[PDB]
Amino acid sequence: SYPKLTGTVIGTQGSWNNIGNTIHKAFDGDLNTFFDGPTANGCWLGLDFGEGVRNVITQIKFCPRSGYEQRMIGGIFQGANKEDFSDAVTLFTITSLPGSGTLTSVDVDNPTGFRYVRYLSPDGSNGNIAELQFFGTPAG
Ligand SMILES: OC[C@H]1O[C@@H](O[C@H]2[C@@H](OC[C@H]3O[C@@H](O[C@H]4[C@H](O)[C@@H](O)[C@H](O)O[C@@H]4CO)[C@H](O)[C@@H](O)[C@@H]3O[C@@H]3O[C@H](CO)[C@@H](O)[C@H](O)[C@H]3O)OC[C@@H](O)[C@@H]2O)[C@H](O)[C@@H](O)[C@H]1O
Numbered sequence: 030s031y032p033k034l035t036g037t038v039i040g041t042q043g044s045w046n047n048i049g050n051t052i053h054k055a056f057d058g059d060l061n062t063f064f065d066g067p068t069a070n071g072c073w074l075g076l077d078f079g080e081g082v083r084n085v086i087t088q089i090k091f092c093p094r095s096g097y098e099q100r101m102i103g104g105i106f107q108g109a110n111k112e113d114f115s116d117a118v119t120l121f122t123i124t125s126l127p128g129s130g131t132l133t134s135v136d137v138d139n140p141t142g143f144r145y146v147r148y149l150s151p152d153g154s155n156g157n158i159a160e161l162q163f164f165g166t167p168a169g
């Protein structure tokens with residue numbers, strides 16, 4: 030069990046109908062609040078750990094938006110060292126319906142240190158996710 034990682038929130042700007050459910054809702058510790066993106070497709074969110082910081086990721090936890098759990102199926106989590114994710118590797122792919130109102134935990138087995146991590150949502154999802162957490166350790 031490694032510590033929860035912190036960083037600068039990055040990702041799709043804005044929110045559905047300008048209501049205010051931005052990417053920041055996925056990092057607030059409340060499983061009742063969620064990111065609702067401004068478009069059906071293309072939405073993503075994640076962390077920049079900072080210039081010169083690289084973490085090895087050992088675990089990811091996520092909670093779907095209540096009532097919209099199907100919108101996570103096919104979503105993937107990536108690590109990268111470029112902010113445009115052109116060097117990204119997939120750390121986990123969501124293949125079954127995540128349980129409602131809880132954090133699903135998945136192990137990651139990849140020794141690479143990453144400056145950036147993200148959740149990349151599937152078409153038709155508006156990026157819907159309630160909470161997103163990364164765990165791991167500074168790269169040696
Ligand atoms: O367009 C973005 C916009 O979507 C808004 O939701 C609309 C959308 O809902 C689809 C979604 O509905 C679930 O159920 C909702 C119901 O639609 C609501 O009216 C009601 O109040 O709550 C229930 C749940 O308690 C389904 O359970 C979801 O699975 C479903 O999502 C889709 O699932 C299919 C597979 O079944 C998948 O292929 C799609 O990709 C996925 O989208 O459409 C119906 C409208 O009534 C909804 O308004 C959403 O509320 C809003 O925040 C914004 O995200």
Ligand SMILES: [Ca+2]
Pocket residue numbers: 054055056057058059060061062063159160
């Ligand atoms: Ca939340």
